[PDB]
């Protein structure tokens, strides 16, 4: 029977565990005069497992632009979240992480929220930024004198809207001038072409299957199914669609057509989840 | 994934893998010629350098990457759904742009998308796939694993997992007896249902409490509520 151990065997002095990370919060919602602010200890480092919320406030009708003078954070473990509304719904818009310079962020409303997410290891110096606000900083002014603005803001008088080819360096004219109008579903509708700004059909003087399939392909759908007009109701500047030796379509406007009608096309769906596995069929 | 069975050649041509750092980290699905759909939760901090992301097409076997049946690809642009919070794990869907156009073959096929007013009723078997861990402790470096799970109503999903609001933006699929799950390792796997003999895309794998835990199924995000956003730039 072991006995006589009348000594303090646990000679080691216990130490409190590094628990309770919680958060430091840091600066909160501020107006325009407040521009420059450190996260919590930006010149030196930031605490691990710290969550902070920075809200940028601007006058109604204005937007907010970011400019990170110094941005040196950890790896993909730590990220920075950007929000605009923070009332009922917010959009990420831009998320920044990792060391190195980052691009500017333009708010879509008169409010911006900045969030910090940190891990428990690899703490870096931090980041800082300031804002100046303004009127449509990220939205270029549309050009007057009948100029059409693209997605990225480039404005041209008329070199787009379904021409022979896109005369735009940006080339953001993804939307076409042919869409299904007055239809019943996504795949069913009336053919409506637009030369410049006016929607019109393509008549049925020489309508064939090849041009129907070409139109269906231009609509992002499959082959032509159930190609038959019913009755005419439009009265716009109707054009003529005719077969061509090449793969392009030619629209010739003419309001003196005979037996005008609106053509209803039901284009089939495109390629879908059709399995092509080669397996034996069990005769059961 | 967990408790699944080995797939056949060409069984899931619309499932593709995403490689970052040299190892598979998240799954994705092929929709258009140069776009993919993947869970936004996994690709959150790695979207600033798409050049380091490698897109693998037809990764039926993880041991063959340079095989002729596998077409390597690179990621050019990564788009994350704006309405993402990482706090409620809501709208965890992301779209990735392929650098070059991808041809369609027998083993590489696109997938359908839900249409308007197209809701799958609860109680229907739906297929899942992924290269994640099948035993919750080990690793998966073998053939693609496939499984089928039934759709569960969100009313029971909230009760069985009293941790999130769930709401109507999530769809839960699994078995009350447990043993089948796909929320470990590869969280980018798609939720696939069968509407007619054409197949459809139902959801994308999302956060899951624990695999094979009794009455603890996974969570999926309804693509039917993101169809407009996907088609806005599907082209
Ligand atoms: C698209 O498809 C529809 C069928 O779904 C097709 O039918 C047209 O529908 C519109 C309404 O959507 C009809 O317009 C009405 O016509 C009656 C006829 O007398 C008018 O009295 C109505 O006048 C009302 O609206 C005016 C303007 O808002 C008001 O000023 C007025 O006080 C009345 O409140 C109304 O205009 C239309 O008659 C039918 N039929 C036809 C042949 O248009 C429609 O034609 C299709 N579209 C195209 C471009 O073909
Ligand atoms: C993905 O699939 C596409 C096909 O949809 C494929 O495009 C092909 O690219 C090659 C190389 O750029 C094109 O070149 C052909 O090469 C053969 C070799 O003998 C020639 O015979 C071809 O000439 C015929 O085809 C021309 C049309 O391209 C005709 O104008 C000509 O008169 C001849 O009939 C041609 O030079 C080939 O044409 C395309 N295929 C097409 C356009 O259908 C692409 O390479 C695939 N990508 C990958 C990564 O596999
Ligand atoms: C961001 O911008 C802020 C706004 O410009 C800056 O905060 C302001 O800093 C000035 C510095 O002088 C403070 O001026 C003082 O204001 C107090 C106000 O009275 C206080 O006491 C009453 C009770 O009697 C209390 O009700 C008030 O709320 C105040 O707490 C004066 O008494 C002083 O004499 C002096 O003028 C501003 O008060 C202060 N604003 C606010 C809202 O506190 C800030 O420094 C900028 N930077 C950062 C990092 O925030
Ligand atoms: C993943 O990559 C692996 C490469 O490391 C693939 O392994 C190869 O798989 C093929 C089948 O797809 C095997 O080919 C078989 O070869 C045997 C015998 O080899 C004969 O080869 C020639 C004819 O080509 C003949 O002249 C010789 O005398 C041999 O008799 C054949 O009987 C089979 O029918 C089949 O053709 C390779 O042997 C095999 N290589 C290795 C190193 O294992 C693997 O298949 C890939 N994964 C998938 C799913 O395909
Ligand atoms: C946050 O505050 C800083 C304060 O420095 C603002 O920096 C500003 O940056 C612009 C560059 O975009 C500076 O203009 C520069 O002027 C020099 C003059 O020689 C010229 O050589 C450069 O090519 C450039 O045009 C500007 O001077 C500078 N501000 C000050 C006071 O020096 C920054 O813009 C602020 N952030 C935001 C979002 O406004
Ligand atoms: C669209 O369909 C109409 C159907 O009326 C086509 O109208 C006529 O089509 C003929 C095709 O042979 C055109 O050629 C003419 O043939 C007669 C045959 O004897 C010949 O004598 C004429 O000298 C002429 O070559 C004809 O010009 C045309 N128009 C008429 C008869 O007024 C129309 O051609 C079709 N559209 C296209 C682009 O094919
Ligand atoms: C697709 O959904 C059907 C629902 O009809 C599933 O079929 C059911 O599968 C379970 C096992 O997962 C069967 O439970 C056991 O089946 C054995 C053999 O019949 C029986 O002796 C046991 O008492 C127990 O019921 C069940 O019978 C079977 N059928 C029904 C009507 O529930 C099926 O598993 C789902 N998945 C696939 C890939 O088909
Ligand atoms: C959507 O699902 C329906 C079933 O609800 C599919 O229709 C089925 O199509 C197959 C293929 O032709 C039919 O098989 C054939 O049946 C006839 C007898 O009707 C037989 O003589 C042939 O040898 C062949 O076996 C099947 O009967 C038919 N089922 C129906 C109409 O109820 C339809 O194909 C599916 N859609 C797509 C796009 O796959
Ligand atoms: C246009 O789209 C419709 C979609 O409803 C296609 O309709 C298909 O119709 C068939 C019905 O044909 C069958 O023929 C069997 C004998 O071969 C007969 O036993 C059976 O009872 C039935 O009459 C149906 O099976 C398909 O499911 C329908 N859908 C599809 C996608 O095929 C129609 O064929 C399409 N037309 C064109 C030209 O594309
Ligand atoms: C998970 O959902 C939580 C829901 O709790 C309640 O949600 C309602 C929705 O608007 C809040 O407003 C109420 O709306 C009622 C009508 O539907 C009114 O009768 C009521 O007076 C009130 O205006 C309500 O404040 C809120 N709380 C309570 C105690 O009712 C929500 O609170 C959580 O934030 C959400 N979790 C998230 C978003 O992560």
């Amino acid at each position: 029977i072991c006995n006589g151990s009348l000594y303090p065997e646990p000679t080691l002095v216990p130490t409190p565990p590094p628990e309770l990370p919680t958060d430091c919060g840091g600066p909160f919602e501020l107006w325009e005069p407040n521009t420059t602010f450190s996260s919590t200890n930006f010149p030196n480092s930031y605490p691990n497992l710290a969550f902070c919320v920075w809200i940028l406030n601007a006058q109604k009708g204005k937007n907010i632009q970011l400019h990170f003078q110094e941005f040196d954070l950890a790896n993909i473990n730590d990220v920075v979240e950007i929000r605009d509304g923070e009332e009922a719904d917010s959009l990420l818009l831009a998320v920044y992480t990792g060391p190195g310079p980052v691009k500017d962020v333009f708010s879509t409303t008169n409010r911006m929220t900045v969030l910090l997410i940190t891990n428990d290891v690899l703490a870096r110096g931090g980041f800082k930024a300031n804002f100046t606000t303004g009127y449509h900083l990220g939205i270029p002014e549309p050009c007057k004198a009948d100029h059409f603005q693209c997605k990225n803001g480039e404005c041209v008088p008329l070199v787009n809207l379904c021409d022979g080819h896109l005369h735009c360096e940006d080339g953001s004219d993804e939307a076409d001038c042919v869409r299904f109008f007055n239809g019943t579903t996504n795949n069913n509708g009336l053919v409506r072409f637009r030369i410049q700004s006016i929607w019109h059909t393509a008549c049925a003087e020489n309508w064939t299957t090849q041009i129907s399939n070409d139109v269906c392909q231009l609509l992002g759908l499959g082959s032509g199914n159930s190609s038959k007009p019913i009755f005419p109701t439009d009265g716009g500047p109707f054009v003529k669609l005719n077969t061509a030796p090449d793969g392009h379509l030619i629209l010739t406007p003419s309001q003196q057509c005979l037996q005008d009608s609106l053509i209803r096309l039901q284009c089939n769906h495109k390629s879908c989840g059709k399995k092509l596995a080669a397996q034996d069929i069990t005769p059961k | 994934i967990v408790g699944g069975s080995n797939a056949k050649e060409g069984a899931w041509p619309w499932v593709v893998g995403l490689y970052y750092g040299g190892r598979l980290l998240c799954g994705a699905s092929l929709v258009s010629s140069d776009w993919l759909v993947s869970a936004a939760a996994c690709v959150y901090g790695r979207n600033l350098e798409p050049s380091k992301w490698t897109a693998i097409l037809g990764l039926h076997m993880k041991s063959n990457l340079t095989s002729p049946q596998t077409v390597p690809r690179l990621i050019d642009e990564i788009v994350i759904n704006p309405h993402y919070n990482r706090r409620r794990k809501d709208n965890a869907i992301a779209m990735m742009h392929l650098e070059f156009k991808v041809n369609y073959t027998d083993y590489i096929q696109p997938i359908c998308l839900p249409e308007e007013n197209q809701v799958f009723p609860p109680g229907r078997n739906c297929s899942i796939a992924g290269w994640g861990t099948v035993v919750y402790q080990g690793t998966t470096a073998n053939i693609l694993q496939e499984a089928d799970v039934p759709l569960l109503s969100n009313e029971r999903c909230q009760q069985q997992m009293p941790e999130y609001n769930i709401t109507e933006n999530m769809i839960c699929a699994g078995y009350e007896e447990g043993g089948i799950d796909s929320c470990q390792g590869d969280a980018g796997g798609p939720l696939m249902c069968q509407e007619n003999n054409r197949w459809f895309l139902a959801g994308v794998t999302s956060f899951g409490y624990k695999c094979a835990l009794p009455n603890r199924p996974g969570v999926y995000a309804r693509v039917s509520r993101f169809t407009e956003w996907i088609q806005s730039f599907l082209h």
Side-chain angles (χ1 to χ4, degrees):
Chain A
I1 301 180
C2 180
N3 202 330
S5 299
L6 300 180
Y7 60 94
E9 180 180 0
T11 60
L12 301 180
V13 180
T15 59
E19 298 180 359
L20 300 179
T22 67
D23 52 353
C24 57
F28 290 103
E29 179 180 0
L30 40 79
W31 286 90
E32 299 181 0
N34 305 91
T35 57
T36 302
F37 60 97
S38 300
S39 57
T40 160
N41 198 338
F42 157 78
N44 302 268
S45 61
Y46 54 85
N48 300 330
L49 298 178
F51 174 76
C52 304
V53 176
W54 302 281
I55 302 178
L56 307 184
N57 197 332
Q59 300 181 2
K60 180 181 179 180
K62 298 181 180 180
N63 62 330
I64 305 177
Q65 176 182 0
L66 287 181
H67 174 61
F68 295 86
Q69 181 68 20
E70 181 175 352
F71 193 89
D72 188 8
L73 290 183
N75 48 16
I76 61 184
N77 293 270
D78 294 356
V79 298
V80 173
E81 296 183 352
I82 301 180
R83 300 179 181 180
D84 58 336
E86 207 183 3
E87 300 179 0
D89 191 5
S90 59
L91 42 85
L92 287 183
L93 184 57
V95 177
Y96 291 156
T97 177
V102 294
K103 299 180 180 180
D104 300 0
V105 179
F106 296 87
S107 180
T108 60
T109 180
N110 55 326
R111 182 180 178 179
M112 178 185 295
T113 304
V114 183
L115 297 82
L116 179 59
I117 303 180
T118 56
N119 61 337
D120 60 330
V121 293
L122 301 180
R124 294 300 300 180
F127 64 96
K128 67 170 179 180
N130 55 319
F131 63 96
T132 184
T133 67
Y135 293 94
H136 297 65
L137 299 181
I139 301 180
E141 178 180 0
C143 183
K144 302 179 180 180
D146 301 330
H147 288 63
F148 295 92
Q149 180 184 6
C150 69
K151 300 180 180 180
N152 288 338
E154 182 178 357
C155 300
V156 284
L158 213 173
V159 299
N160 58 331
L161 302 177
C162 286
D163 203 330
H165 48 18
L166 301 180
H167 330 88
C168 179
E169 301 179 0
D170 186 59
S172 61
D173 191 9
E174 300 180 0
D176 52 354
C177 294
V178 43
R179 298 174 184 178
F180 272 160
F181 283 91
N182 218 333
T184 59
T185 181
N186 299 330
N187 301 271
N188 194 339
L190 300 178
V191 189
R192 297 298 298 269
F193 288 106
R194 181 180 58 178
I195 296 179
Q196 301 179 1
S197 60
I198 307 181
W199 307 89
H200 37 58
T201 184
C203 297
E205 296 185 359
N206 299 97
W207 193 268
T208 58
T209 60
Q210 180 180 0
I211 56 178
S212 304
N213 297 331
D214 295 0
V215 170
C216 286
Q217 292 180 0
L218 292 182
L219 292 173
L221 293 176
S223 300
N225 186 344
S226 300
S227 174
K228 179 181 180 180
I230 319 179
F231 57 92
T233 48
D234 194 4
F238 302 152
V239 307
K240 297 181 179 180
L241 180 54
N242 300 328
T243 61
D246 54 350
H248 303 263
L249 300 182
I250 302 179
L251 304 174
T252 301
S254 180
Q255 298 180 0
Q256 300 180 0
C257 303
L258 300 180
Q259 300 180 0
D260 309 6
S261 60
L262 299 183
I263 295 188
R264 174 178 298 271
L265 297 186
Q266 305 179 5
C267 304
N268 191 20
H269 188 265
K270 291 186 301 180
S271 300
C272 171
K274 180 180 180 180
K275 298 181 181 181
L276 300 181
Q279 296 295 332
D280 191 9
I281 300 180
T282 303
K284 294 181 180 180
Chain B
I1 295 179
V2 176
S5 60
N6 303 331
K8 299 301 180 180
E9 299 180 359
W12 315 102
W14 50 80
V15 184
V16 298
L18 309 171
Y19 277 74
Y20 182 83
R23 61 177 181 179
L24 179 71
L25 296 180
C26 202
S29 302
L30 181 69
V31 178
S32 70
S33 60
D34 54 351
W35 285 94
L36 305 175
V37 49
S38 60
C42 66
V43 281
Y44 204 179
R46 312 169 188 89
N47 62 329
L48 295 184
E49 297 175 350
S51 60
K52 294 185 178 180
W53 277 93
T54 302
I56 298 300
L57 306 173
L59 189 63
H60 189 13
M61 287 69 182
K62 299 180 60 180
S63 60
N64 288 348
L65 297 85
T66 60
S67 60
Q69 227 295 100
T70 298
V71 180
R73 276 296 184 269
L74 299 180
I75 299 297
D76 180 70
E77 183 180 0
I78 300 181
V79 179
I80 307 181
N81 193 311
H83 309 273
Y84 184 82
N85 301 120
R86 195 197 167 90
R87 306 305 176 181
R88 306 173 300 179
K89 300 300 180 300
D90 191 9
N91 311 319
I93 173 179
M95 296 296 297
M96 309 177 69
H97 185 196
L98 300 172
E99 185 177 0
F100 298 96
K101 303 298 181 179
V102 166
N103 275 332
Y104 293 161
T105 181
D106 302 0
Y107 298 89
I108 299 179
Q109 296 290 344
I111 202 179
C112 264
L113 296 178
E115 297 183 0
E116 184 178 0
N117 301 330
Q118 181 181 1
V119 180
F120 306 95
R124 177 191 302 269
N125 298 14
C126 295
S127 300
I128 57 180
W131 302 275
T133 305
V134 305
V135 295
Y136 196 73
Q137 299 180 0
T139 54
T140 297
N142 202 330
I143 192 182
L144 170 63
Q145 303 293 339
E146 62 185 13
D148 302 332
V149 289
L151 303 186
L152 300 180
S153 60
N154 297 330
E155 178 182 0
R156 186 180 180 180
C157 189
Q158 297 180 359
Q159 300 180 0
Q160 65 206 190
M161 297 188 303
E163 294 184 352
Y164 307 90
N165 281 22
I166 302 300
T167 69
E168 301 179 0
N169 196 23
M170 302 178 181
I171 172 177
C172 312
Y175 290 91
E176 57 179 0
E177 300 181 0
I180 308 298
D181 199 330
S182 60
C183 298
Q184 181 67 210
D186 187 10
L191 173 61
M192 301 168 296
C193 295
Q194 182 181 359
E195 181 69 20
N196 222 132
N197 197 262
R198 55 166 55 257
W199 217 273
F200 265 92
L201 179 60
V204 186
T205 310
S206 182
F207 67 100
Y209 189 85
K210 182 177 300 301
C211 297
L213 197 66
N215 211 127
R216 220 64 177 271
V219 182
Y220 305 92
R222 301 181 180 270
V223 188
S224 60
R225 291 192 167 184
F226 302 109
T227 299
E228 300 180 0
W229 178 67
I230 295 180
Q231 294 182 355
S232 58
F233 52 86
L234 194 64
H235 77 79

